[PDB]
Design a binder for this molecule. Sequence first.
Ligand SMILES: Nc1nc2c(ncn2[C@@H]2O[C@H](COP(=O)(O)OP(=O)(O)O)[C@@H](O)[C@H]2O)c(=O)[nH]1
Ligand SMILES: [Mg+2]
Length: 384
Amino acid sequence: TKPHVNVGTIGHVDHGKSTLTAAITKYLSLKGLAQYVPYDQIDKAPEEKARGITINITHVEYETEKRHYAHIDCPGHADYIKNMITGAAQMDGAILVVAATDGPMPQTREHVLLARQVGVPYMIVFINKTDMVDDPELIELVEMEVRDLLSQYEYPGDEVPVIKGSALKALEHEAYKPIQELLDAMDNYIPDPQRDVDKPFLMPIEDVFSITGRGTVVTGRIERGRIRPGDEVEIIGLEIRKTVVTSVEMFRKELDEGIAGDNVGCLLRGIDKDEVERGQVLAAPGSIKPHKRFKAEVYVLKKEEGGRHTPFFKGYKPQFYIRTTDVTGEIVLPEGVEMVMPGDHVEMEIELIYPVAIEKGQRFAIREGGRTVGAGVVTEVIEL
Ligand SMILES: Nc1nc2c(ncn2[C@@H]2O[C@H](COP(=O)(O)OP(=O)(O)O)[C@@H](O)[C@H]2O)c(=O)[nH]1
Ligand SMILES: [Mg+2]
């Protein structure tokens, strides 16, 4: 059975993302490896909802002989902003489409920035529209500039695969080679995703209660990794404490192990009922640390998406929903940024009133009153 990998086409509008997506499904349909989805159906993307946010996004699926790919493609720049920050459809690798004619453009830069900010681990470049460029040295110019763009945002720009071709020619036989070259790069450059159960154990604590004569139980849904009776864990958030999970219980049965997705109850050895609380996390020791201060790429929701008309500003103190708890925090904006209007995104500095377990790449909501006013992805954690 083939591993499932999430990918998507990013880049500036009209550079050929939707055309490349169609060409991939057509090329693979000829080998019985994909449903052919024509360009018109990919381009007219349907709507879907990430909580109150509506995003236009096309999902298609196709297989190489080795892999099953889940592929996303969006019409508008705003769709990519919302999809990448809210994590509606996450990506193991991004296919950066850059037209060789006009070359890299504002959304080329911004989508690379967003990919880095949201933690997309690998980039593959497809230089499109080469059928329109007669001077081959100018195609190399575009490649070099895209490589420098990736390096500017800490991607290994010298090492990423860069495929040149014409998505349109492929969509209309020798023009299939860039498609095959692209798929081989996806097969070889993007590694098989490590699955949640080999990741370090983490479970946010939802509820705490005491069994008299036995000890303190914390309940929560395991986010990643495994927990087994006898394992050592740390309680992170709000001074770090070590303990042993004596027992893992789910559906009135003691488990040999709890895995990601299991809502379990963990009996904590020697933990007083008043010293652990909702919002802390159980974690494999050393795998995550408490922080009061961190940076995060934050999208400010529009009023129509459930947010407010008011922008974010220096000193704004909303609530930060970090896993199972919400904590007051104070906003600081980067240099030269005085406000963030709804619909915009920026990297903000956040200082919570008390430390919580938080890590790079973690997503969180920002709420003010009853409205969700922002969505963020942690980009940096600051030492306590
Ligand atoms: N000449 C040429 N035109 C292309 C190529 N790929 C796409 N186009 C034209 O792209 C216009 C926009 O590209 P499209 O895929 O719809 O947009 P995108 O998904 O927003 O980048 C249409 O004319 C596409 O057919 C190509 O490889 N060569
Ligand atoms: Mg498109």
